[PDB]
Design a protein around this ligand. Structure first.
Ligand SMILES: [Cl-]
Ligand SMILES: [Cl-]
Lengths: 144, 142, 141, 135
């Protein structure tokens, strides 16, 4: 197999090699995945390449009355999975966001099937975490 | 807690309380779950109610190249999980399908928290079988 | 009375149902000798792992029948809404057919839910093994 | 070679890097950065886990729990959470995982160790610097 230190161009074609539809604004660096927006509660998901590391991250908006209970359950959520990470991103002017992410290190090179397996295992664990929080009525709906 | 014998109206109301979208061909006796079909491999998943038994089942199309290795792997797949079940459905006009299901008996009643945990554990454990089977290139995409 | 049962709760529940069980010093499973009256059933036990109750029965498969039995494992599993069947094969063991059902108790169960779990287990498990025994796929006990 | 390693392959891989482990368990425990009372390597469901545990002083459980989100967002690869049982003191778990379902190389594992040690010790160094852990 090949072992690539993948650039942004490498991830763009690898995703199309997997049939994954992606989106990217003009001067930006994130590769947004609209396929992740069919999971209930998922407002946005994107692939990022920072410091030789791939970051599959999805974002869900927390109900303001659920912020404290969800914050207390972050350790149990992070312990529920061997790969997924969950934390609260809360800004003054924004609504509280639940960021769920998983990282793949590409410093020493990765293979295409390593990246493929990483994406779908990420979008399975991220799916189960966000879908479980929406089952607890902790998130806001993604539609009007 | 309330210990109920649920009907198909109880389940979809419970699914609504869980924020789970369900689609129902009014020709269909089951509650189809579109959230489960974005897992690559799964082409359909549904919640059924037959003889006081709730059936969370997901179906994936198997590559004809892999029905023999997958059939030999059914024992290790079923033994890999305490709750889920996995088998093949092979007719003659349609492609072979892998069925991954989980079962919950309701004839002696069930609470809301028991059903919620059933759906949660079913969706996790089924998706891992589908995710791993797709990693071994045993399934057709959707 | 929604309880998250321990193994001691399972022992007392089987006694309330008049169902004899057997448990060693070393182990942790509650073997049920009543299931051994069914032809081909070598052993049946109740386990409790990861907040899940596991009623499983085991049958020794004839070596010449291993491939045919494996072939219609899918049909056996599709034959019921609750039963699970698979093959257990080690290098020093005779091949085994494991027929089992599971009831997760993570969020609690009632004594009535457990009573029906074991009765539906014994019915569905026996009808699988006895039909495989009627197809000349199992060894005598 | 791209390999799905067992525990023995991880044993030999730690041998190749000059890193010692404790003989035993199912993890490979490893033997300074004050706060941590145990660090180990786990192999669970085709996933290698490098985790370190530090006992939290009860006077800091609520503050540290409030900072868990900022701690997890400060790192690209490491995860932090609390493990609180009724008979133990509250523990802080700092972990980084390397999934291995589709194999792994030896330098992918070697860099996984180097990256986790520097990222885990960066979390443990900061919490202990803020008087959140026990000696
Ligand atoms: Cl963001
Ligand atoms: Cl056994």
């Amino acid at each position: 197999t090949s072992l690539v230190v993948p650039g942004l161009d490498t991830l763009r074609q690898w995703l199309d090699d997997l049939g994954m539809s992606f989106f990217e604004c003009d001067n930006c660096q994130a590769l947004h995945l609209p396929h992740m927006q069919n999971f209930d509660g998922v407002f946005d998901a994107k692939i990022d390449l920072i410091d030789n590391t791939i970051l599959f991250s999805a974002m869900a908006e927390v109900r303001p009355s659920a912020v404290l209970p969800l914050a207390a359950d972050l350790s149990a959520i992070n312990a529920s999975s061997l790969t997924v990470k969950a934390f609260l991103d809360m800004q003054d002017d924004n609504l509280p966001k639940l960021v769920v992410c998983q990282s793949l290190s590409v410093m020493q090179g990765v293979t295409y099937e390593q990246f493929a397996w990483f994406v779908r295992q990420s979008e399975e664990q991220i799916s189960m975490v966000i879908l479980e929080a929406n089952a607890h009525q902790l998130l806001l709906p993604t539609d009007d």
